[PDB]
Design a protein around this ligand. Sequence first.
Ligand SMILES: [Mg+2]
Ligand SMILES: [Zn+2]
Ligand SMILES: [Zn+2]
Lengths: 98, 136, 461, 118, 488, 50, 49
Amino acid sequence: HARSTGSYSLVTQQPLGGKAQFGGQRFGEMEVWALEAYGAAYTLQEMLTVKSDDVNGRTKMYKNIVDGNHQMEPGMPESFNVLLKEIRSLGINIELED
Amino acid sequence: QDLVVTEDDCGTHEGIMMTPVIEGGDVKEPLRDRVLGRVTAEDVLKPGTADILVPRNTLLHEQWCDLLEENSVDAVKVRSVVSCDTDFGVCAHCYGRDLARGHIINKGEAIGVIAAQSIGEPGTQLTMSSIQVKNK
Amino acid sequence: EMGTVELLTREGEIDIAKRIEDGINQVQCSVAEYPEAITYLLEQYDRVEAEEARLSDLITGFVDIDPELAREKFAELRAQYVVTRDTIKHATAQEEILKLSEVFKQFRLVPKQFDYLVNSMRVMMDRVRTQERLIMKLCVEQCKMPKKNFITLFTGNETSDTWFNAAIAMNKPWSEKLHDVSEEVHRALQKLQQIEEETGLTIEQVKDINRRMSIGEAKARRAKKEMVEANLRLVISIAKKYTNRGLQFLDLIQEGNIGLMKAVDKFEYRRGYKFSTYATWWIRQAITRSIADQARTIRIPVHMIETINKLNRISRQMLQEMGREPTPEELAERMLMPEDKIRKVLKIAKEPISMETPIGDDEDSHLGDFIEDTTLELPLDSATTESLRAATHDVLAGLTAREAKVLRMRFGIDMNTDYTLEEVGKQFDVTRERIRQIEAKALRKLRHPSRSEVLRSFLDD
Amino acid sequence: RQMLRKATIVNAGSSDFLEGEQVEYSRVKIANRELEANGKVGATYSRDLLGITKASLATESFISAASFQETTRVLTEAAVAGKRDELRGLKENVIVGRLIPAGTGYAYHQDRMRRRAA
Amino acid sequence: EFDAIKIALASPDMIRSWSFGEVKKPETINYRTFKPERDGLFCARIFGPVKDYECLCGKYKRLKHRGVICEKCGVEVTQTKVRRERMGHIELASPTAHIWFLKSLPSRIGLLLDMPLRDIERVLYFESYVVIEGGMTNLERQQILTEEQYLDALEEFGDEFDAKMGAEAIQALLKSMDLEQECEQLREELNETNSETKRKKLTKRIKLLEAFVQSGNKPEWMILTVLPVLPPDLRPLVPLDGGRFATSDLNDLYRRVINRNNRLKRLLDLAAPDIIVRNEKRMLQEAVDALLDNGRRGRAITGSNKRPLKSLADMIKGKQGRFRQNLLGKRVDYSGRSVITVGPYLRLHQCGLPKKMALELFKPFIYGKLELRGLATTIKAAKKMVEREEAVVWDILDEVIREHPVLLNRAPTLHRLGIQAFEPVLIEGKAIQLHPLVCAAYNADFDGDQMAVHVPLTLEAQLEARALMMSTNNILSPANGEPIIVPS
Amino acid sequence: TPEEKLLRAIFGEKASDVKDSSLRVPNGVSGTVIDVQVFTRDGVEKDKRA
Amino acid sequence: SAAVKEFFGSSQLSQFMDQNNPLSEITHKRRISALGPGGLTRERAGFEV
RNA sequence: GCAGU
DNA sequence: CGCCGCGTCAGACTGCACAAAACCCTCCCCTTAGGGGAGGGTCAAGGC
DNA sequence: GCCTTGACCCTCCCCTAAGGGGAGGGTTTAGATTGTGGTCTGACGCGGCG
Ligand SMILES: [Mg+2]
Ligand SMILES: [Zn+2]
Ligand SMILES: [Zn+2]
């Protein structure tokens, strides 16, 4: 089974589960430690942002791969926005400072 | 996870005194596979004194370890990350060699994840009167 | 906390209901001490003589519906108002007022027009308290002094500032600072005293009427509390029959408690029926209405709830008599509704699955992570859209700037809105049908296979 | 090294710590350094050995600790403490989708902390 | 973009500043037409439009007028994606203690008030009174009272002293307390105490009080008077294809909270007896505490499957929470998986990749090379060409994989050599051909093992696959310096 | 969108009110149809195949 | 009917039959299972059971 | 739940 | 101090199969007529 | 000998107002009804009682 792109999940915008739902392989926690043990910071970053969750970023990635330009413009993964909205639904004020 | 090699040298002079692991009557790890790849913390000198066998801040690669077993030096003070003066990280000299490449480690290596994986990878291979001198 | 209240006997409910009734009719006499309410009663009585509304929600009867009692004995109260309107010539008028009260004794009043009367009385209350608090904190925001020295002179004057002549006599600076207030109370201090005699009675004695009203109403509400807190076991004994029907146990007993308070303030003991038989009707109503309203995620109305319940009951009996689940085309003929109505009712009655439902008892998976987001756009379609934008931009760059801008202006290309021919007619300084022909010109030009070979591949197969 | 990462102040010295409180060892070390640079004598400490769980949960970054385990305790402690997390380790930069500060993302973070400092 | 993440307590002003409207009714959607109901848990006026650039009455339908608040229905005309970002709120009729700052030990309300958690749980479950102000009376400020003791105090002292029960009382105690004064008083009685246990209690209380005074927090923000409502696209009510709906447990918990809250407002308007309003305040407290953390206080609420409802705290914690399941590891595009076989003909840097896996993993690369080389006039034409699998897309596919590494991964990835890069050699099978010498690194035998293939997209990702992770760079082990690409 | 609106204006192929939701063979699967069953709800008129 | 129906359809011991070959069926019918309602849980069963 | 590694 | 009660934790990937009623009253939706507007059909003048 | 710009008239389509009807929310019922329902985990750290 293989996918380039396809259907994404509803709450988190990550790809769906398995080859019946056209899949996407879980790049889980131990594989993230594998890419952190190498210095593969960009491979890791594109596994996090523009392959799962960066909704404005994965469409840009597709249009850049198609237009011959292998470059990413990563933003914030939508799961982190789900997390900031779920922590704020408890009585807790979590923020992003600058 | 957050331990990264962030410096080239903290200039410290501390370090652990590496010796061979002798459990009772027999050796279990020689000095060679214990100091190979470390940097020395002090000048290693021959049993005949006043001539430094290995200089102070030297990386002990295989030629230097062959020099340490030509002579009979059995205790080498090496530099360790537990005695690194670097705050928020570890210097590249107190770590030593990057075991996967064979040279001194680069600045930026994520050594804590490598250490944690290297310890917990063999985890599935684990489970669940008078003295008589043996030789001369 | 509930078992620590003892139940009532048959005669205990009688005593409590009579306490409630005495509180409410004495507070209704307390608003009868306020004769603007008498004027309102009598003007709606003459409107009853014109039949503005029905008598049952005017009067419930009279204690020692028949309408001929009310007409002539409201005329009797009118003669009583006659003998109290002018017989003041102020020491002899103080008997006819409690005679008014105890001749008003025999009156019954309804909830809603009495609610009009008590909201008027609460306007009276708010006016009295806001004027007395104006007196309170118009002087103490100016002065620093314990104001009991200034209340000792106020009670009884009620007409003017003659009680201010001895205010300055203390000569401690408070009444010095009150110098600067001694004027701006002006249009306050008389205006209440205006309506004082439009309702006839003195501001201090209508404050006495207000506090006697509060005493009587708290007397009524105290005895409404004893009847609710005693019958709280009835609510539980009823609500245990509705337990797994969509609401928690406590939600059912709290809605039944609301129904029991409704039964208490709608109960009258003169019918001689035991209170539990009335509260049971009201508690059943409250609990079933609550289940119909707030037990479902996608809420369906109470009429569709009754329909679904009738459907489930009928299908239950049909399954019991013929040993199989009845088809909607026989379920619709045991009922008398059309078959498609039965079909839509059966489509309605389903409750939503939880997205945390594990699939095949597999805990690491759930229903929630097989549901895709269908509203998204495929990135192939995003690339198709950007490529179509580029292709359209080039094949319209292959035209005259005037007509190319006519097409970009008539459709919404490169612009937030599209424009009809009149708009651009005002814009291009050209009459409408000419630029219509310009649009047709450019469309006929682009239909050629010269430029439209790349665009045709943006059409489906 | 990651286990013996905290210290307890035995003598508060001419510093802003309290006796008997558990501080990060690097914090108290650099505070003693910058105090001794100005002549004032620094604090004296006793190092602590925490378990790998009790040291993972005691990091100065609440995102890593809340991500590890006992999310509820970590988040309440961080909330009532009014904490701040500067995304300095690797997990806080994986959570937010950034380059990790190790490897080919180490130059990026050196640029980012030498240009967001001055 | 941003350099830090600050966490703090949420003021009721902060909770009302996030929100775009109050959820007054428990309505989720209308049952006949699935449009969302007004003032409800799914409210297009509160939470934003349910369709892109379209108000819910359909009067405004295009982005010609965007950002327009419709007057027939109050729905803004903007993207529907704002339903993932726009929070709402609920005005609680009674102050409600936050369960996290009451029950996660050590209790912050308890540690702050110097009060045992049994006493606080008895005060805020309406089982005892507490004297929030003593006055000229022998009653101290933390002195709990029973009901009859409170009646006796009212006999002896009257309306001078102040005593309350419930979370209103706890909120008055947290509000009336002075933090810097009590902190310096505790520092005084810590300098004069030598009992080590009392010194431990005093220093933890002092660090709590000074952590409150150094941050912007106030203590009474630990008692919820306003409650936030998660955006409705994060607790979605979605129609399954079979006509049935599928909701999150958060809608059930929010709907319970709003039902009990509106009933409490009802009872407070009806002037109900104190038994009923006390029971309703207790029910609202336990419904809010089941919304925040289900099962933390007593029995978990279970709905309609006899399985406990997943609360807000359960969304973010555990092995199935956001933090571990969606943020540290995640499902990933451009990823395939298949069985591994030997392929002993390979070089150390090569894997065998099935043509039918590599044609899907590299689909946008092939679309772009078909557009570029003129073989397709469009991306739709290129998509149809890849779909029909013409003879030219295989030449294009041989072009696009030439020096393009892929990462091969065998889970469990025990160490970093469980992910290595390889240049793909297109084979005709359906199984990956993994070089023999790397098997010991993966702990992979060919008895049914499967491996995932990932495509590095960017030039940085390709250059890390080639420079850092390629299997020719990985011939020593990082645990010990010995060879791991070793014959077998 | 306005661009495909112009595309409809030029070529004239008006889009259809229906969407193709047909059942297709899954990718990679290749075989023979050996049985077809049609279950029709009572009241729905049966097609020629049923 | 609901008790019997949920037992037969959605219990842990009422399992989708393994029907690969005759042996799969004949050894799925002779199966014994310590798990199930009234039995163990596979995560909290020690080394000795 | 049942299997595969 | 000893002890009891309570909270936290327990590998990673894959498939497979999957989930009371009756009467009143107002309000919103469906239907239809209308009216305005917005193109569409077929010519009358110079200009090309 | 062949192209624009109006010109007038014709035709259909979308928004608006109203009317009928289904729907949906509301109020009231008076023989007595008085306190509801799994246990199959062990290890470790901590914190309050006693
Ligand atoms: Mg194997
Ligand atoms: Zn060092
Ligand atoms: Zn609108």
